[PDB]
Design a protein around this ligand. Structure first.
Ligand SMILES: [Mg+2]
Ligand SMILES: [Mg+2]
Ligand SMILES: [Mg+2]
Ligand SMILES: [Mg+2]
Ligand SMILES: [Mg+2]
Ligand SMILES: [Mg+2]
Ligand SMILES: [Mg+2]
Ligand SMILES: [Mg+2]
Ligand SMILES: [Mg+2]
Ligand SMILES: [Mg+2]
Ligand SMILES: [Mg+2]
Lengths: 293, 205, 50, 159, 170
RNA sequence: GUCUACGGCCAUACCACCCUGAACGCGCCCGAUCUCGUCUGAUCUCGGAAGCUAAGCAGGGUCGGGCCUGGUUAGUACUUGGAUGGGAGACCGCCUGGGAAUACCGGGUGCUGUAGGCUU
RNA sequence: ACAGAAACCUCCCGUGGAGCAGAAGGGCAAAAGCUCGCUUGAUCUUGAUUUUCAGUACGAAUACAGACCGUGAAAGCGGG
RNA sequence: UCUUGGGGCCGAAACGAUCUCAACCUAUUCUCAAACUUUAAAUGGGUAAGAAGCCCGGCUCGCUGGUGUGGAGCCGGGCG
């Protein structure tokens, strides 16, 4: 027999990590450097672009930190994209670009800078940085908050970053992590990046499956077929998505409806209930003991 | 060999245990703190008499060893080698030093370890004897003799607890009836109304 | 006289033996009188004493 | 004699409290310190940069300078028979806004409002604080019961 | 009816050959694993120096590799055939895994080669159910849960059903 | 009622086991052409949507351990100031104020900010 | 499998009970530890401050400011 | 208590049986720390208790900046 390590003393001495760290959601080493503002800038907010890719969505937010909790300034979601013509593939690189662009256009519309800072209305996929215009309100500057993502080349967080810079936001970055950057030659190809932004990597995959295996094709792209999304029309679908996104980036909140009260889980038992339950258990145990005797 | 115990009777210095900073301490004179029928169950010996210190002082491990023998011999002679259980309740942890002369004088005068002593307080128990109730007079006489091996004033006091347990003698038996006390050999375990109800089942099954 | 008692006796204006003053009582002053307790006789005077 | 070492004697002073080690909560860096603020200095061992010297632990000062990470504090230090005003540079991890002036500031506002509210009403209100007065006369009702007689208990040798 | 997401599967097959000494033998051993599996193995270095074993720290003394998916089952069949699908109850770890050893690698259907020699190796089969990867991911890593774990009995039962094997007492 | 993204305080939130989870989610999950990275598409990256709450996750449970908070311990131990108080001393008592901590007993078991959902 | 108390492989628990050049003390868990990759902020420069203190020097150290760089996707971090 | 050893002890002999004493683990229990500690006093050490304050309106900036933002400075004014 060996010592119980997780004994009573192991818990008397135990210190728990920050809740968000226990949950595995926040990197507090990274958060401190991202969100903390220089003390000589006082209350000047330090904005950052949050990009989180779930199993079925892309969440893009513009937040600055306060003592009580972050204040989300603007937010766009990939599940909004159907309003703009994109029905499927809401977690690919092209959707990330659309989600990011919608975030930038939505934010600039709010501050009234959309006309001033239109960004790169024509997607070339190349290094582009917006510059403030003298005599006009400065360009909105934020930073990318990649979370726990492994920020390698082609990571979709940089697709959303590319959408936001092309939307008019000022976000420091390089092209090293856009798809099309070649490590061997240390050279960046803007056409390869433009392919991913338009999803030609997805479309080229479709033709591959179609010309290689019909059954594997149906398995991999069943919902593309259902929505009548074909490899030829993909680029114009996304192009029609950008133009509509720039045309109207405003969000209209889903109208909140009253709901009849309904409790879907138990409440805590009261002290009387818990105390009685032990009383019932004790009587039942003795009652069963007396019978067997 | 060793100095008269009057040289170290008073708790003048801070506690000086045998540790990694005090190396070379010789072994203590007292190595056995229990004797008699240590294995008696809690219920065989309801009586407990203490020798209580009236003085704040240091007792030497030689006096603890001497008293242990003195008290034990009289108990064996009057109650049998299995009619009692003695427990010396003081352990000699404080170390006393000696600055051995024959010359440097008082230069570099920090002393080497010389022995060990137990630091006892007013009201602290020095040793205890539990035996049967018809040995109340024998316990008092056993402890009265042991006092002559110690410096200062002690008092013999018959406890109201049950043997070496912390529970009052008059209410010990009922607590055992209600299974609030479960004998565990020399002493008892205390059963609170807490924790998994399964334990309560095992006790009450 | 100790430094703290010596200051408090000077604030009460009792710089000499058998010197007398009236003191209106409250938490602030009652705690001062506690400091100089071994150095003063005090109590509640009546109209005749005033 | 003793060494003149900078961090001598701070075994417990600069250590972290029990079960409060690890990450530094980020609201420690979200505090806004302005020129003229009152701050309590408390060295934190987790951050070894900008650590105030041990003589400044538990002293309160006035902020006179603010930089990217630290502030300049004017804090009184007594050295023999004089008190010096010392200007130290301390990273904002080791300080915290003092609450001492708040009870004053809270009073300043309530006074000015009372002084303005009573003025328009042509009355008079108390603004100055006062030490606790001796408790006024009052009746104590026995409620038809006799006070419990108390006696000293016999000595009993509980050894 | 058992939930489909509770069924057992072979997470990975761990093949190891502790040659015991760097040099020509160890390099040959790496080749044998490459033949059996089809992927380059990776050496492992001695953690310490043990005079009796004749190993010095940071010295390559073993070669191992991980085989998963369809290839893992095919090679597992080879080894269990060599054992006649007979294992001992002790061969099953309390965590739901099991393993066995092979004396000569030629018995696994590998043609002998004069330039390589013969070698033994270890087979350790790590079992799992769907969802076992929540503990190996980066974001929101968690523990699978008591009801989702695999027991010595369950693995022994799986071995019998999957291969009709025999679990020898002792 | 409750979830998701980002949080503040950082166990009342942890740990162990058990029960239950509507909808949207979050996941598990299916693949490796592309981006990317591995001995291994297990992880990381990427493309998906057949299946499932089994697990994570959420809520509830346990005369649960821990944690938090009270009571008792106790006006006790300790302590500021006082005496030409006691005692051979060791120490102790009183006067004037302050005043703890175990064992033991009870109760509680996350709150909450911004943005976005689901829930007649 | 050879393989043993001890070689290498696997799973599980693991609040640090390891490690961080050295004395000890403090500090540290997606790090301050281990491993890779790129590197020379261990560079150039004026002041202020802290520590011992006489509020002198040295030494060491702390916030800044001006350049030139490294690194990172970036926020930042780095003048041992 | 077999997860290891000492004595035996039926034996054909094995982790078969039989015990037994050790170590091991589990709750207990006596006694301790100047160079231990979850707790934690008294006495004590800073600070604040207004006119150098409080509240208004405006101007300057090369500093910071989505923002006529932020911060600092300056100017006039009202409050005892
Ligand atoms: Mg990072
Ligand atoms: Mg003599
Ligand atoms: Mg001395
Ligand atoms: Mg469980
Ligand atoms: Mg459902
Ligand atoms: Mg896979
Ligand atoms: Mg379930
Ligand atoms: Mg409990
Ligand atoms: Mg909750
Ligand atoms: Mg790191
Ligand atoms: Mg610089």
């Amino acid at each position: 027999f060996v010592k119980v390590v997780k004994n009573k003393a192991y818990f008397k001495r135990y210190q728990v990590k920050f809740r968000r760290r226990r949950e595995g959601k926040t990197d507090y080493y990274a958060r401190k450097r991202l969100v903390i503002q220089d003390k000589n800038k006082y209350n000047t907010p330090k904005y950052r672009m949050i990009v989180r890719v779930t199993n079925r969505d892309i969440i893009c937010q513009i937040a600055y930190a306060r003592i009580e909790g972050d204040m989300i300034v603007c937010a766009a979601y990939a599940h909004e994209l159907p309003k703009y013509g994109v029905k499927v593939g809401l977690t690919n690189y092209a959707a990330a670009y659309c989600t990011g662009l919608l975030l930038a256009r939505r934010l600039l519309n709010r501050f009234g800078m959309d006309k001033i800072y239109e960004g790169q209305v024509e997607v070339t996929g190349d290094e582009y940085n917006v510059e403030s215009i003298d005599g006009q309100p400065g360009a909105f500057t934020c930073y990318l908050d990649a979370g726990l993502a492994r920020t390698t080349t082609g990571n979709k967080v940089f697709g959303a970053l590319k959408g936001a810079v092309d939307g008019g936001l000022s976000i420091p970055h390089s092209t090293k992590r856009f798809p099309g950057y070649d490590s061997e030659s240390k050279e960046f190809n803007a056409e390869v990046h433009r392919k991913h932004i338009m999803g030609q990597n997805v479309a080229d995959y479709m033709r591959y499956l179609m010309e290689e295996d019909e059954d594997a094709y149906k398995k991999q792209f069943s919902q593309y077929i259902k929505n009548n999304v074909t490899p030829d029309m993909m680029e114009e679908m996304y192009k029609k998505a950008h133009a509509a996104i720039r045309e109207n980036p405003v969000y209209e909140k889903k109208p909140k409806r009253e709901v009849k009260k309904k409790r879907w889980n138990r409440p805590k038992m009261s002290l009387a209930q818990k105390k009685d339950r032990v009383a019932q258990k004790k009587a039942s145990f003795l009652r069963a003991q007396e019978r067997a005797a | 060999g060793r100095r008269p115990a009057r040289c170290y009777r008073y708790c003048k210095n801070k506690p000086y245990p045998k540790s990694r900073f005090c190396r070379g301490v010789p072994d203590a004179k007292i190595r056995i703190f229990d004797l008699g029928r240590k294995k008696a169950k809690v219920d065989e010996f309801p009586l407990c008499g203490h020798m209580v210190s009236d003085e704040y002082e240091q007792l030497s491990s030689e006096a603890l060893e001497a008293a242990r023998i003195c008290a034990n011999k009289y108990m064996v002679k009057s109650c049998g080698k299995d009619g009692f259980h003695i427990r010396v309740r003081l352990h000699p942890f404080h170390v006393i030093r000696i600055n051995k002369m024959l010359q440097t004088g008082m230069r570099g005068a920090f002393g080497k370890p010389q022995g060990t002593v137990a630091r006892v307080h007013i009201g602290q128990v020095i040793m205890s004897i539990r035996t049967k109730l018809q040995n109340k007079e024998h316990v008092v006489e056993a402890l009265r003799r042991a006092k002559f091996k110690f410096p200062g004033r002690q008092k013999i006091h018959i406890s109201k607890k049950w043997g070496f347990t912390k529970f009052n003698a008059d209410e010990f038996e009922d607590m055992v009836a209600e299974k609030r006390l479960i004998p565990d050999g020399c002493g008892v375990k205390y059963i609170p109304n807490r924790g998994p109800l399964d334990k309560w089942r095992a006790l009450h099954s | 006289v100790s430094p703290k008692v010596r200051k408090v006796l000077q604030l009460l204006r009792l710089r000499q033996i058998f010197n007398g003053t009236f003191v209106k009582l409250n938490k602030a002053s009652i705690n001062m009188l506690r400091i100089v307790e071994p150095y003063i006789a005090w109590g509640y005077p009546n109209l005749k004493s005033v | 004699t003793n060494t003149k070492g900078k961090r001598r004697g701070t075994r417990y002073m600069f250590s972290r409290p029990f079960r409060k080690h690890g990450v530094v909560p980020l609201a420690t860096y979200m505090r806004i310190y302005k020129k003229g603020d009152i701050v309590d200095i408390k060295g934190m061992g987790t951050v070894q940069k900008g650590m105030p010297h041990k003589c400044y632990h538990g002293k309160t000062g006035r902020v006179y300078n603010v930089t990217q990470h630290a502030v300049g504090i004017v804090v009184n230090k007594q050295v023999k028979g004089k008190i010096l005003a010392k200007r130290i540079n301390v990273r904002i991890e080791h300080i915290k806004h003092s609450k001492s002036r708040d009870s004053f500031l809270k009073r300043v506002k309530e006074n000015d409002q009372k002084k303005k509210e009573a003025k328009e009403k042509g009355t008079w209100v108390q603004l100055k604080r006062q030490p606790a007065p001796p408790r006024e006369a009052h009746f104590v009702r026995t409620n038809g019961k006799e006070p419990e007689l108390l006696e000293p208990i016999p000595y009993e040798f509980m050894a | 009816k058992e939930n489909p997401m509770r069924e057992l599967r072979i997470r990975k097959l761990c093949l190891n050959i502790c040659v015991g000494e760097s040099g020509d033998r160890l390099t040959r051993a790496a080749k044998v694993l490459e033949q059996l599996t089809g992927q380059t193995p990776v050496f492992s270095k001695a953690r310490y120096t043990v005079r009796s074993f004749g190993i010095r720290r940071n010295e390559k003394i073993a070669v191992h590799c991980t085989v998963r998916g369809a290839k893992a089952e095919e090679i597992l069949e080879k080894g269990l055939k060599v054992r006649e699908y007979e294992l001992r109850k002790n061969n099953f770890s309390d965590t739901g895994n099991f393993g066995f050893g092979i004396q000569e690698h030629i018995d696994l259907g590998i043609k002998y080669d004069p330039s390589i020699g013969i070698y033994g190796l270890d087979f350790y089969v790590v079992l799992g159910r769907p969802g076992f990867s929540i503990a190996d991911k980066k974001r929101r890593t968690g523990c699978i849960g008591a009801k989702h774990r695999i027991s010595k009995e369950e693995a022994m039962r799986w071995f019998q059903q999957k291969y009709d094997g025999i679990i020898l007492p002792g």
